[PDB]
C-alpha cells in the first residue's frame, strides 16, 4: 500500500527553542501539529512543550 497523508516539517529543535525565547522574532512561524498547522506563538507553554518533545528525525 503506502502511507496516506503526511505533515511535513523541516526544522531544527533549537530553532523552536529560540522561538520560545523570543516570539517577536518569528511572527509567521508555522508548524504542522497533528493534521493542521498553527503559528508557534499561538500555542500555550504546555502545548509548546508537547511539540518540542516530539521526535525530530535526523539525517541518516
Short mmCIF file of the C-alpha atoms (twelve columns), coordinates in Angstrom:
data_MODEL
# 
_entry.id   MODEL 
# 
loop_
_atom_site.group_PDB 
_atom_site.id 
_atom_site.type_symbol 
_atom_site.label_atom_id 
_atom_site.label_alt_id 
_atom_site.label_comp_id 
_atom_site.label_asym_id 
_atom_site.label_seq_id 
_atom_site.Cartn_x 
_atom_site.Cartn_y 
_atom_site.Cartn_z 
_atom_site.pdbx_PDB_model_num 
ATOM 1  C CA . UNK A 1  0.000  0.000  0.000  1 
ATOM 2  C CA . UNK A 2  1.526  3.223  1.145  1 
ATOM 3  C CA . UNK A 3  1.138  5.818  3.806  1 
ATOM 4  C CA . UNK A 4  -1.599 8.321  3.333  1 
ATOM 5  C CA . UNK A 5  -1.458 11.950 4.421  1 
ATOM 6  C CA . UNK A 6  1.658  13.385 5.914  1 
ATOM 7  C CA . UNK A 7  2.515  16.643 7.620  1 
ATOM 8  C CA . UNK A 8  5.967  17.811 6.760  1 
ATOM 9  C CA . UNK A 9  8.045  19.994 8.980  1 
ATOM 10 C CA . UNK A 10 11.606 20.767 8.074  1 
ATOM 11 C CA . UNK A 11 13.192 22.491 11.034 1 
ATOM 12 C CA . UNK A 12 15.649 22.206 13.890 1 
ATOM 13 C CA . UNK A 13 14.630 21.776 17.503 1 
ATOM 14 C CA . UNK A 14 16.974 24.553 18.544 1 
ATOM 15 C CA . UNK A 15 15.149 26.995 16.327 1 
ATOM 16 C CA . UNK A 16 11.930 26.237 18.162 1 
ATOM 17 C CA . UNK A 17 13.720 26.675 21.450 1 
ATOM 18 C CA . UNK A 18 14.826 30.063 20.189 1 
ATOM 19 C CA . UNK A 19 11.263 30.774 19.182 1 
ATOM 20 C CA . UNK A 20 10.101 30.054 22.695 1 
ATOM 21 C CA . UNK A 21 12.683 32.511 23.938 1 
ATOM 22 C CA . UNK A 22 11.727 35.313 21.613 1 
ATOM 23 C CA . UNK A 23 8.413  35.124 19.949 1 
ATOM 24 C CA . UNK A 24 8.794  38.531 18.337 1 
ATOM 25 C CA . UNK A 25 11.453 37.073 16.084 1 
ATOM 26 C CA . UNK A 26 9.202  34.521 14.395 1 
ATOM 27 C CA . UNK A 27 5.871  36.132 13.770 1 
ATOM 28 C CA . UNK A 28 4.768  33.926 10.953 1 
ATOM 29 C CA . UNK A 29 6.421  30.750 12.037 1 
ATOM 30 C CA . UNK A 30 4.108  27.845 11.346 1 
ATOM 31 C CA . UNK A 31 4.292  24.168 12.139 1 
ATOM 32 C CA . UNK A 32 2.226  21.057 11.487 1 
ATOM 33 C CA . UNK A 33 0.881  19.818 14.811 1 
ATOM 34 C CA . UNK A 34 -1.484 16.958 14.052 1 
ATOM 35 C CA . UNK A 35 -3.108 17.286 10.657 1 
ATOM 36 C CA . UNK A 36 -3.355 21.056 10.730 1 
ATOM 37 C CA . UNK A 37 -0.959 23.985 11.035 1 
ATOM 38 C CA . UNK A 38 -0.628 26.578 13.749 1 
ATOM 39 C CA . UNK A 39 1.562  29.544 14.475 1 
ATOM 40 C CA . UNK A 40 4.113  28.578 17.074 1 
ATOM 41 C CA . UNK A 41 3.364  31.732 19.032 1 
ATOM 42 C CA . UNK A 42 -0.317 30.799 19.179 1 
ATOM 43 C CA . UNK A 43 0.342  27.819 21.444 1 
ATOM 44 C CA . UNK A 44 0.347  27.609 25.228 1 
ATOM 45 C CA . UNK A 45 3.561  26.931 27.015 1 
ATOM 46 C CA . UNK A 46 2.392  23.427 27.816 1 
ATOM 47 C CA . UNK A 47 1.274  22.912 24.250 1 
ATOM 48 C CA . UNK A 48 4.690  24.005 23.067 1 
ATOM 49 C CA . UNK A 49 6.267  21.553 25.453 1 
ATOM 50 C CA . UNK A 50 4.424  18.816 23.621 1 
ATOM 51 C CA . UNK A 51 5.833  19.878 20.280 1 
ATOM 52 C CA . UNK A 52 9.481  20.308 21.235 1 
ATOM 53 C CA . UNK A 53 9.405  16.912 22.933 1 
ATOM 54 C CA . UNK A 54 8.323  15.165 19.701 1 
ATOM 55 C CA . UNK A 55 10.769 13.271 17.531 1 
ATOM 56 C CA . UNK A 56 12.781 15.163 15.018 1 
ATOM 57 C CA . UNK A 57 14.067 12.697 12.523 1 
ATOM 58 C CA . UNK A 58 17.621 13.397 11.647 1 
ATOM 59 C CA . UNK A 59 19.670 12.592 8.651  1 
ATOM 60 C CA . UNK A 60 20.658 9.041  8.285  1 
# 
